[PDB]
Structure 1
Amino acid sequence: MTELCPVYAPFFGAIGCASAIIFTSLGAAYGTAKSGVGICATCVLRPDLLFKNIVPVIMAGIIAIYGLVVSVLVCYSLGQKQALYTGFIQLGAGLSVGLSGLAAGFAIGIVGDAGVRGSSQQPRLFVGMILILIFAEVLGLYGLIVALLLNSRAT
């Protein structure tokens, strides 16, 4: 349309909504797949730890929930005639919870796979596992904080 609001301006917004959930779901997938292969190899012989050792896939799933919130929040601010200012803050919120939630979902996958294979040879590692795991989780929450803060400047 005009100079402030062109027609390619909701491409950034649409890409951002897609990016927020595809990159967090790729990181939460890698976290689930390495933790689930650590669980389904762990509890072959130690089946009574099946509810303690599942916290890496719950915690990797919280990255997916964080990604989902950003996508819903910036799809509420999408529109045909939107300014290009709000297009790039929806793309900044997109790839700031995106490429941070995939790296945080990767690090939950490697730490959670090392943890659930380690907190069964010695159960004293279960407190040390999750405190490392929280650190690899809130890096996705730090990505989420930027997105919320940056989506707070739309219109």
Structure 2
Amino acid sequence: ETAPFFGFLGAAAALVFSCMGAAYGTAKSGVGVASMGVMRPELVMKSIVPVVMAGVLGIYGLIIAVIISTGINPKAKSYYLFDGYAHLSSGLACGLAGLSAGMAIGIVGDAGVRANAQQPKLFVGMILILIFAEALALYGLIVGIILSSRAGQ
């Protein structure tokens, strides 16, 4: 009965948490880029793309929200609490993973913006750190997809 409400709430949380995490990471990276621009403006665009990389987390959250929305329909089946609660849990897990990854990526980018300016040879290390951080987001997306798969009971 309330399973559709639980699923809708879970999808909303999955969208909102990922959006907030991506926004925080992007804001931190933008502040770092603005600080670094006055020193070596030639390198302002050399790290702007990893700064805006929070769009990846935003898109992942949007995809998770769309997937959660797709799976809820009375016509297909009168899904019970076992389905709505599962969808809500999958959405919440995906959103929390996205928010954590976004915050970590924002901090890492804030560090790397100054690090690359101080040492151009550290760009590869910063990229490696960013990829290691985004591994968590990839794992979270995989877990969310796996959890949402079983929700179609």
TM-score, normalized by the shorter chain, greater than 0.5: yes
Contact 1:70 1:93 in 2 (8 A): no
Partner residue, 2:99: 102
Contact 1:43 1:49 in 2 (8 A): yes
Partner residue, 1:88: 85
- Decide which structure has greater helix share: 2
Asked if 1:53 corresponds to 2:47, the answer is yes
For these two proteins, the number of residue pairs brought into alignment is 149
Q: CA RMSD in A?
A: 1.3
TM-score between the two structures when normalised by the length of structure 2: 0.91
Rounded to whole Å, the distance in 2 between the matches of 1:83 and 1:8 is 8
Contact 1:101 1:140 in 2 (8 A): yes
Contact 2:5 2:84 in 1 (8 A): yes
Contact 1:66 1:141 in 2 (8 A): no
Partner residue, 2:57: 63
TM-score between the two structures when normalised by the length of structure 1: 0.90
Contact 1:21 1:71 in 2 (8 A): yes
In structure 2, the residue corresponding to 1:149 is in which secondary structure?
helix
**Percent pairwise identity:** 58
Partner residue, 2:140: 143
Rounded to whole Å, the distance in 1 between the matches of 2:15 and 2:27 is 17
Q: How does 1:3-152 map to 2 (within 5 A)?
A: 7-80=1-74, 81-152=78-149
CA-CA distance at 1:23 after TM superposition: 0.5
Rounded to whole Å, the distance in 1 between the matches of 2:89 and 2:135 is 18
Which consecutive unaligned segments of at least 5 residues does structure 2 have? none
In structure 2, the residue corresponding to 1:118 is in which secondary structure?
helix
